[PDB]
């Protein structure tokens, strides 16, 4: 009747080291009240990418994200991507210049090494503090990141200079919130600023904190409190 | 008429290095309005243990806890123990198997090196993803911690394998909150998740943050704001 989809990282499952962990947890899920085929286990291998286009399969999605300082990705940036509904298009930095439209039009770029330099254009296609000809005059706004949500003064055209060799930059519109998902973060006291806006900080119920000890423990808790977690989504 | 009991760690007093610090502070306490014998000074030497069975002596208890990253104990786990009313019984991992009953039945183990492996039993005393015979098939949920509050899927029996040599594991029921106590934490911005439940995060008045500089300063502040601190407990 209803379905629960658990998203975790590879490292999570690797640490568990059992060929039947998905199965054991499933029987344990009957306890909390979910029928034999009612729960599904999806394995994301690369969080950054998954966060962008996370093909959510089930009715209820609870995604496990473990703070990993050895990857240099911002938890906030990742939350902002999963917790929300984004809609991206591709950008051709080579032939076209771009401009963001509203507080919801952002440039999300990600890859090996993302280095973005920008040059604002006046209404003539001329630089403002830069020469659209020599990128040595551009303004650097990202130096080799793995995930970057860039924000420029709305309503202004910009010649962009990304290192497309190792990066991919796409033009995204954030249309709202996703109700069928939840974020459960493991580790790092870290408070999440998921607003581009320095003014606001929203803290929702679909944004939960578990204290890391071992992965088996994490899953036991997720199971022992499935309804509590589900109730925070349906609420 | 009323009594105030200050709990601090040894290091706190050692840094103060005076044979009359308890006395000096006491005269200073008359200022804030507490009679010559109205305040008591209790020295906990081991926070982990104290947090479990803290024989609270006075009417008002304000306990000083200093974030110490060189001990690997979770502040949240420690808060969860002091701030609340727990009631434990001993567990014999050798002869019996166990199961937690409600969102309030947890297994709190602590010692030199606590390493807990678990094996869920179906209604036959048979393993589920494990052989109750070889602990190499168990599920590890704690690898050498100094304090551990373990949580398993409620209503399921488990053969437990703790390293009782260096650890002690006891079955605790959390019956509620303690009103005569307060936690004043020193250091670490750290926000405290004192719920086993990933869904909720409760922040109470009896859970206060002081910025560390020197211990003498900490005590001066505690004295300079005794009533403010007391009012947060009686409130």
């Amino acid at each position: 009747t209803s379905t629960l989809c658990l998203y975790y990282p590879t490292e999570a499952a690797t640490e568990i080291n059992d060929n039947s962990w998905k199965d054991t947890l499933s029987q344990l899920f009957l306890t909390k009240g979910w029928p034999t085929g009612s729960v599904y286990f999806k394995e994301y291998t690369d969080i950054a990418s998954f966060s962008v286009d996370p093909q959510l399969y089930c009715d209820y999605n609870v995604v496990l994200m473990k703070y990993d300082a050895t990857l240099q990705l911002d938890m906030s940036e990742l939350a902002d991507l999963i917790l929300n509904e984004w809609l991206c298009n591709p950008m051709d930095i080579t032939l076209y210049y771009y401009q963001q439209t509203d507080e919801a039009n952002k440039w999300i770029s990600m890859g090996s090494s993302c280095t973005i330099k920008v040059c604002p254009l006046n209404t003539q296609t001329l630089g403002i503090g830069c020469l659209t000809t020599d990128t040595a005059t551009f303004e650097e706004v990202a130096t080799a990141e793995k995930l970057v949500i860039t924000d420029v003064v709305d309503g202004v055209n910009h010649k962009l200079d990304v290192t497309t060799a190792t990066c991919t930059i796409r033009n995204c519109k954030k249309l709202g919130p996703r109700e069928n998902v939840a974020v459960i973060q493991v580790g790092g006291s870290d408070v999440l600023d998921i607003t581009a806006d320095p003014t606001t900080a929203p803290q929702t119920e679909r944004m939960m904190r578990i204290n890391w000890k071992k992965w088996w423990q994490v899953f036991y808790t997720v199971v022992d409190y499935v309804n509590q977690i589900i109730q925070a989504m349906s609420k | 008429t009323s009594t105030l009991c200050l709990y601090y760690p040894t290091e706190a007093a050692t840094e103060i290095n005076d044979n009359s610090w308890k006395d000096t502070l006491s005269q200073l306490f008359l200022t804030k309005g507490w009679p010559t014998g109205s305040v008591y000074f209790k020295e906990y030497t081991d926070i982990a243990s104290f947090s479990v069975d803290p024989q609270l002596y006075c009417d008002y208890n304000v306990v000083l806890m200093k974030y110490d990253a060189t001990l690997q104990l979770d502040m949240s786990e420690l808060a969860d123990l002091i701030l609340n009313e727990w009631l434990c019984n001993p567990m014999d991992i050798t002869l019996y198997y166990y199961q937690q009953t409600d969102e309030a039945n947890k297994w709190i183990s602590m010692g030199s090196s606590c390493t807990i492996k678990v094996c869920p039993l179906n209604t036959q005393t048979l393993g589920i993803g494990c052989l109750t015979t070889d602990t190499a098939t168990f599920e590890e949920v704690a690898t050498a911690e100094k304090l551990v509050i373990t949580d398993v899927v409620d209503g399921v029996n488990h053969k437990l394998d703790v390293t009782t040599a260096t650890c002690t594991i006891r079955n605790c029921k959390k019956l509620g909150p303690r009103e005569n106590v307060a936690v004043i934490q020193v250091g670490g911005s750290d926000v405290l998740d004192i719920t086993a439940d990933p869904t909720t995060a409760p922040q109470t008045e009896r859970m206060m943050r002081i910025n560390w500089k020197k211990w003498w300063q900490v005590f001066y502040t505690v004295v300079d704001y005794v009533n403010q601190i007391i009012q947060a407990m009686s409130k």
Partner: antibody
Amino acid sequence: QVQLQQSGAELMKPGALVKISCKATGYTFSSYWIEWVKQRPGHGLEWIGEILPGSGSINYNEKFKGKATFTADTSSNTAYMQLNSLTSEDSAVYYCARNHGSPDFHVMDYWGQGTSITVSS
Amino acid sequence: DIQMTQSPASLSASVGETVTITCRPSENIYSYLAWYQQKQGKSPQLLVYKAKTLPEGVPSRFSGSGSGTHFSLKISSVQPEDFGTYYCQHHNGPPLTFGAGTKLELKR
């Protein structure tokens, strides 16, 4: 381009204890389990146990529990196995292989070169 | 304790011929069987996992098959590079146990 390099060969006196080591290169050391296999001339391959560096999970073949004890240094990127109370029959070749990821559990894909121990008074 | 039973203990053939080693576990290894090849004076090398799947590098004349209590490996157009010892191991959870081994010799 993954690779585990084990320490050099040694020869202890009966009763002593030794330290083998495996150094990882080419993968996130903390994210994969390390296996330990014993190989005597006429006994094929014996599994000893495994260890998960970082988290610290450990598993012992019931038959080695007393003899072997694993450790791992994350800063070093090396896993260690220590054989206690050496016997003339502990003499053999010891390997350390990487236990693949979540995909397929317990399939060792990369093997060390092999360390060699000889107990003889 | 799952007991792997490798046969034959020794096999003998010349290049081009098609041999077939065979592992038979005491219990039911669902399909969690592997095959490693070890060459004279070196280390083992994963050659086949989950019964029939081969890692990447590995040639394709190497064919794994079976499930349950019967499994088989099947080197086909044996070339001079396929001569040495072959082991089989189940990977259905600890404790892991290996085969006895099959030694493939060069006929003549």
